[PDB]
């Protein structure tokens, strides 16, 4: 409880298959008209959930991948491009490698999650919704 303003600004991408999220270079940053070209850079972080299965043993639900602007969120201190499990990096041409403190993260008590939209022509990877 008590998440504060630590949520992703966007809804998650759900992984229905067995391959990690990835995008072609230059692709994958969610659309956000309240941001500038230098802002268009960040990471998706895999969030796992467990539930009790019908047989009484714990079970994984499908992973969900949440976008955070560079320098914000749970991996705020992680450098762009660092190889870290559960983290994948995306940037649009025109991005700058600077932390996006001015955008930050979302307080769900004050703002709903922006439906995650990618520009027309983005390669959406297999098994992702």
């Amino acid at each position, epitope marked *: 409880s008590n998440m504060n303003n630590t949520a992703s600004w966007f809804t998650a991408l759900t992984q229905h298959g067995k391959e990690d999220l990835k995008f072609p270079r230059g692709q994958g940053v969610p659309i956000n008209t309240n941001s*500038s*070209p*230098d802002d268009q*850079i960040g990471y998706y972080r895999r969030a796992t959930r467990r539930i009790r299965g019908g047989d009484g043993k714990m079970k994984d639900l499908s992973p969900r991948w949440y976008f955070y602007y560079l*320098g914000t969120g749970p991996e*705020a*201190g992680l*450098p*762009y*491009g660092a190889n870290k499990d559960g983290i994948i990096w995306v*940037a649009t041409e*025109g*991005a*700058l*490698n*600077t*932390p996006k*403190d*001015h955008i930050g993260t979302r307080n769900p008590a004050n703002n709903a999650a922006i439906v995650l939209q990618l520009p027309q022509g983005t390669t959406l990877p297999k098994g992702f919704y």
Partner: antibody
Framework: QVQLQESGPGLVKPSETLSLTCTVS????????WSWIRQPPGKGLEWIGY???????KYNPSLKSRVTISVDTSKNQFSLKLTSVTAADTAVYYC????????????????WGQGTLVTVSS | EIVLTQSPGTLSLSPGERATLSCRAS???????LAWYQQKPGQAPRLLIY???SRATDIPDRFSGSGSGTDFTLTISRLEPEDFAVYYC?????????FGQGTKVEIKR
């Protein structure tokens, strides 16, 4: 090879407007960020602002009320306008390109002009 | 703004010595938002290190950057007379981008 060159008056009266132009040769303005940085005589460096080739800008908040950076792709130039100058604005003004050849988007100044001194004086 | 304080203000060392330059920030700039520039008299600055610890490609590996948060170091091994310069750190972890006031490295003879 990419070369930058500042031009403009070396002497400006107090309260008037300082204007400089950077001319780029051996490469295009297009696709890059461009920046102005200044250095008062005997002192350190101060970042003024940048402009992306397609027009978006970001300025140092302490100068924002007085600064305009503009870009002219047709002439392969970008420019600086600084209003209401005082002796605190006397400095060598550098233009620079921002570009990270490693592909990791770092805002590093990879090519610089030679600098042009502007003295604010009556 | 984030203020960068460089220490010492001047350094005087013999060729072949190892030089240690300090840059300390007033607020954290994480681990990849710091650059170092070298400035010789009459010249524009020149990129040495970026991303706190990544070295520019035309710079030899006797230059190295380290640190994180607020505490950063530039190390120059095998100092040379041509290493006389003012060395500036610069942060881009916060707007506005800001420079330290420099450490001038004098070569002893």
């Amino acid at each position: 090879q990419v070369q930058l060159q500042e031009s403009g008056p070396g002497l400006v009266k107090p309260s008037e407007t300082l204007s400089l132009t950077c001319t780029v040769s051996g490469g295009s303005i297009s696709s890059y960020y461009w920046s102005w940085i200044r250095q008062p005589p005997g002192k350190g460096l101060e970042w003024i602002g940048y402009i992306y080739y397609s027009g978006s800008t970001k300025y140092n908040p302490s100068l924002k009320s007085r600064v305009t950076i503009s870009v002219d792709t047709s002439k392969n130039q970008f420019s600086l306008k600084l209003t209401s100058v005082t002796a605190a604005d006397t400095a060598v003004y550098y233009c620079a390109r921002i570009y990270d050849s490693s592909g990791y988007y770092h805002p590093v100044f990879d090519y610089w002009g030679q600098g042009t001194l502007v003295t604010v004086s009556s | 703004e984030i203020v960068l304080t460089q220490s010492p203000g001047t350094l005087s060392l013999s060729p072949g010595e190892r030089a240690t330059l300090s840059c300390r920030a007033s607020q954290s700039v994480s681990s990849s938002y710091l650059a170092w520039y070298q400035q010789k008299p009459g010249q524009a600055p020149r990129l040495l290190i970026y991303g706190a610890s990544s070295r520019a490609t035309d710079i030899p590996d006797r230059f190295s950057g380290s640190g994180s948060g607020t505490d950063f170091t530039l190390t120059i091994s095998r100092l040379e007379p041509e290493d006389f310069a003012v060395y500036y750190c610069q942060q881009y972890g916060s707007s506005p981008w800001t420079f330290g006031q420099g450490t001038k490295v004098e070569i002893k003879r």
